[PDB]
Design a binder for this molecule. Structure first.
Ligand SMILES: O=C(O)Cn1cc(Br)cn1
Length: 165
């Protein structure tokens, strides 16, 4: 069970935490990965979660891509959570650094509604280049299931809490 989270709404919770460390502690049913369409877990949250699985997430993801092809921006797939969670929900938020449509962020968060409870990062934040304040707004206005957000950066966490409407 999740501890130390600030409650933002009926169903959205937030904590300044490293999502890999949080996943190892909680062992949630679902950990969300900040995936790209190719499931190439190189950096940000994806690189960190993959390294914590000793690259097993990448090996499983390469088999998934070989069979199914790439995901869509805004889409997701459920794969194993390995040593971190029961499942990993790989969600592709739009990457502003690839010129992707920020309007797809709501579609990306809709994937969370297929899971009653999730440990997640803010979609499209960090190396995906979107405004994290707007990502949190889309999260609370889209996700209806119980989402526990892990914000890696303390300054960003404090700014997200202090500016939350
Ligand atoms: O804090 C987050 O979860 C997203 N992020 C912002 C920076 Br700076 C580094 N990562």
């Amino acid at each position: 069970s999740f501890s130390g989270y600030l409650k933002l709404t009926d169903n959205v919770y937030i904590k300044n935490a490293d999502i890999v460390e949080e996943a190892k502690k909680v062992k949630p049913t679902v950990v969300v990965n900040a995936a790209n369409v190719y499931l190439k877990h190189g950096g940000g949250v994806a690189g960190a979660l993959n390294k914590a699985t000793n690259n097993a997430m990448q090996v499983e993801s390469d088999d998934y891509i070989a069979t199914n092809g790439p995901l869509k921006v805004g889409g997701s797939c459920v794969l194993s959570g390995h040593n971190l969670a029961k499942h990993c929900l790989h969600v592709v938020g739009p990457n502003v650094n690839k010129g992707e449509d920020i309007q797809l962020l709501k579609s990306a968060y809709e994937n969370f509604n297929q899971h009653e409870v999730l440990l997640a990062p803010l979609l499209s934040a960090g190396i995906f280049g979107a405004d994290p304040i707007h990502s949190l707004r889309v999260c609370v206005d889209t996700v209806r299931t119980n989402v526990y957000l892990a914000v890696f950066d303390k300054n960003l966490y404090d700014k997200l809490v202090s500016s939350f409407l």
